[PDB]
Amino acid sequence: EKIKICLQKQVNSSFSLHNGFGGNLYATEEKRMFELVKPKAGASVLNQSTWIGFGDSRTDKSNSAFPRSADVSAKTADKFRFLSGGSLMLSMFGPPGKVDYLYQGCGKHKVFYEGVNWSPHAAINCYRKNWTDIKLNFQKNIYELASQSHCMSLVNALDKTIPLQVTAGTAGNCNNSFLKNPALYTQEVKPSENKCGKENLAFFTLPTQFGTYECKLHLVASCYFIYDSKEVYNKRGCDNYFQVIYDSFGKVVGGLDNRVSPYTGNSGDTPTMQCDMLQLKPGRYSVRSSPRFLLMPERSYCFDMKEKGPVTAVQSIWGKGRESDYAVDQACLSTPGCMLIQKQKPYIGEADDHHGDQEMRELLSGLDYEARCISQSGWVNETSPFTEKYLLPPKFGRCPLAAKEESIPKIPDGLLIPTSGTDTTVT
């Protein structure tokens, strides 16, 4: 007897009807095509090998109590050029009674924890008590030049020529001497005895190399004393105050000349010092100044200026009890290419109050991983072209784009049954 057999499809219980072009499809379960990625708080790096850091006491591998004292891991710390008590600003200006160090290195991404060692607590008063503006402006320029360089190094000495008429100065508010960057020199000049001195002329040569380091641009500080008035200067000098920086050609590039510009002080018999930040290319420069004062700059930072790249700047502030400034923050936020890392909770250290903060550690934890994107909103090492929402303006790497999970496609899963013609679904 004839029997009819058919291969039948029947759809049961829980099912989704995925719509297409050229047949539709039934499936029992369904799931999302992509999963939204999230940026993780703190700092991390791309490539995990093309980066370099400039450190303090909390990134120092030679710290006796290191694990405790450290705001970073050992792994992370290895890429740093550290020294306990150190600061870029301390090596830049070399104030007496503080540490001094040759900061230098190369890399695509530069990581700074600079600042805390020259905060208001440090109490430098070499004719200037509030360092904050100088610190800020110095940092701003460091960040600027660094996010545009591959290699950088401190320049702790340079070529100079001083005229025999003047000999090295000292100041009681600058411990027992004077700074290692603006070098003070004076000659005998006494207006009352009518023993009037001569203007100074001195030379200096900025080197276009510093060992292996290639110097295409130098960050130097042009400093000078700001006197209140005529009468005040005229106690100690017969003429008028002036300190001016000339180039090789004969053009002036900075300083203060009170033979042609009015006096602007407010510190009485004693003046107050102002240091302007200048960017200078290598060559033979000259300086001129009034008889009683010569302030030759003898230090600078050397930048190769080769390529642009990320810069991370960590908020370098003290533990409890020590007065801190926000120069770091301010400077970063006013220069492009740097990402600021800042603390939401107070700084409370393990080793002592100023070293080994809990928060800072779980932020700088990322520096041991290899990120696929880093942004001012955080870092990510996980893949996926999407994120819940947009990441803050400066960002580097393979960026994820903003999208809603409800708008992501769904993929059929479990039991799948194909529809064909118009015959296909009976009811």
Partner: protein, 162 residues
């Protein structure tokens, strides 16, 4: 219009009963309907579904890591741009989803046509004009043994023609 058993192109809603792929059989001009599970070619269909899913996986990877490696140093906003790019890429995802569903569907249907061919190949007497994915056989010619071989793949005693 076929009665209570219908072809392979068809799919019927049976929410609380038996579902998936099943063998629907009954006598021509007579006896009731018999329905029973196909759990043995489903590894074939299913295995082919894994190959289809392999395609899916690939195509999904091909949409991952598409955007270029940035190095934005400026603090300027690009949200209005990101939005316009996202709205476009979202549209693209819509299209390729519908395209993928159809391509998968089609390739899945063609694996049901491999079963037809194989079952038809198994016994000469299985070749007949009936309905898409339906066939007719005679119980005076082929017993349980050969039927069980032919479409339940048990390899039991093939049909004797003399």
């Amino acid at each position: 219009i076929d009665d209570l058993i219908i072809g392979v192109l068809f799919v019927a809603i049976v929410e609380t009963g038996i579902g998936g792929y099943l063998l629907g059989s009954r006598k021509e001009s007579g006896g009731g309907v018999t329905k029973e599970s196909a759990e043995k070619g489903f590894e074939k269909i299913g295995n082919d579904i894994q190959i289809l899913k392999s395609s899916i996986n690939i195509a999904i990877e091909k949409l991952n890591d598409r955007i270029s490696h940035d190095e934005q140093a400026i603090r300027d906003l690009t949200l209005e741009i990101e939005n316009a790019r996202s709205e476009a890429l979202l549209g693209e995802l819509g299209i390729i989803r519908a395209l993928l569903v159809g391509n998968i569907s089609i390739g899945l249907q063609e694996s049901l046509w491999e079963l037809a061919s194989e079952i038809t190949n198994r016994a000469g007497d299985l070749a007949v004009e009936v309905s898409p994915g339906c066939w007719i056989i005679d119980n005076n010619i082929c017993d349980q043994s050969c039927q069980n071989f032919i479409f339940k793949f048990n390899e039991t005693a093939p049909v004797p023609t003399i």
